[PDB]
Amino acid sequence: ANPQKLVVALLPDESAATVIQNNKGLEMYLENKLNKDIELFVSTDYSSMIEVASKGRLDLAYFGPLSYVLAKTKSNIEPFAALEKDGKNTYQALVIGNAEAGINSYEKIEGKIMAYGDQASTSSHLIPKSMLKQKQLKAGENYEEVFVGAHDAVAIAVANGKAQAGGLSKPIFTALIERGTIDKNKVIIIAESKPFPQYPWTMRSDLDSELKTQIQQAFLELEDKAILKPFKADAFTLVTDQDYDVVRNLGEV
């Protein structure tokens, strides 16, 4: 209940060095506020994060929405905060196409290779897959799916031409363009999803009351631009479990 050190896991939605480096600023702030030491953990894939969480081995975990839903079925954890941008607490998936191949509509996806990220990804699997299904594209019926493991790997493949289309997170696509990792004109945005709730920061439920409240507070109070720059976020807001029922519903269907 009162750990001297805090194990903090971060979703491997991109390469580990990108993820680690994005949260370094936030790690330092949380050391100063909680007066505790933090070791970051970035798993090899989303499923191994979910496993590590299900051992009671993590103190905090920054999960994606679907991965949170899956981890919560077998882990004693509690969502408490999520990024806010422009007083909004949500985010979008994109469907993108390879521009050389002229992949600029849903109809051009038919009979081609569609890149997804991790199988437990919300915005690089579940969401883009539902968007494709609403448009009568079904995996292994009228197109071929490949799982390339991460959002940055999706962007890379689609821009390369190894895949003709892909599904990934709109903020990650945006960061990738701004950092120069991907050339913008090699990819065409086909569609954007509806709003889904942002990734939940979660904590272990059997943590001490006063520590749980201190952690939540630390997030809610954070205001400086430099620390949130790698997420293009103005703040954190609070979230609860029920906010993820929209994701469960889509996961059910």
Residue numbers in the entry: 10 to 262
Show passages lifted from the paper.
Here we elucidate the molecular basis of high-affinity phosphite and hypophosphite acquisition by determining the ligand-binding affinity and structure of the PBPs of phosphite and hypophosphite ABC transporters from environmental microorganisms. We over-produced and purified PBPs of three putative phosphite transporters; PtxB from the globally important marine diazotroph Trichodesmium erythraeum IMS101 (Te_PtxB), PhnD from the oceanic picocyanobacteria Prochlorococcus marinus MIT9301 (Pm_PhnD)35 and PtxB from the soil bacterium Pseudomonas stutzeri WM88 (Ps_PtxB), as well as a PBP from a putative hypophosphite transporter, HtxB, also from P. stutzeri WM88 (HtxB)18. The structures reveal that ligand specificity, measured here by thermophoresis, arises from a combination of steric considerations and the interaction between a ligand P-H hydrogen atom and an aromatic π system in the binding pocket. The structures of two distinct types of phosphite-binding protein and a hypophosphite-binding protein reveal that a P-H…π interaction ensures high-affinity binding of specific ligands, representing a universal mechanism in these PBPs for recognising ligands with a P-H bond.
To determine the structural mechanism of phosphite selectivity we co-crystallised Te_PtxB and Pm_PhnD with phosphite resulting in high-resolution structures (1.95 and 1.46 Å respectively) of the closed, ligand-bound complexes. In the closed form, the amino acids that form the walls of the binding pocket pack tightly against the phosphite moiety and a single water molecule that is also buried in the binding pocket. Each oxygen atom of the phosphite contributes to an extensive hydrogen bonding network to the main chain and side chains of a cluster of conserved residues from lobe 2 (Te_PtxB; Y55, Y100, S130, T131, S132 and H160; Pm_PhnD; Y46, S126, T127, S128, H158 and D205, Figs. 1d, e and 2e, f). In Te_PtxB, it is not possible to determine the protonation state of the phosphite from the pattern of hydrogen bonding, but given the pH of the crystallisation experiment (pH 4.2), it is also likely that the mono-anionic form of phosphite is bound (phosphite pKa 1.5, 6.739). Both proteins contain a conserved histidine as one of the phosphite ligands (Te_PtxB; H160 and Pm_PhnD; H158), which could help stabilise the negative charge on the phosphite. However, in Te_PtxB, one imidazole nitrogen atom acts as a hydrogen bond acceptor to a mainchain N-H (S178), suggesting that the histidine is neutral. In both structures, the hydrogen atom at the R1 position of the phosphite points towards lobe 1, packing against the face of the aromatic ring of a tyrosine residue (Te_PtxB; Y208, Pm_PhnD; Y206). This tyrosine sidechain forms a cap that is stabilised by intramolecular hydrogen bonds to residues on lobe 1 (Te_PtxB; D22, Pm_PhnD; D13 and N176), which in the closed conformation, contributes to the network of interactions that connect both lobes of the protein and bury the binding pocket from solvent.
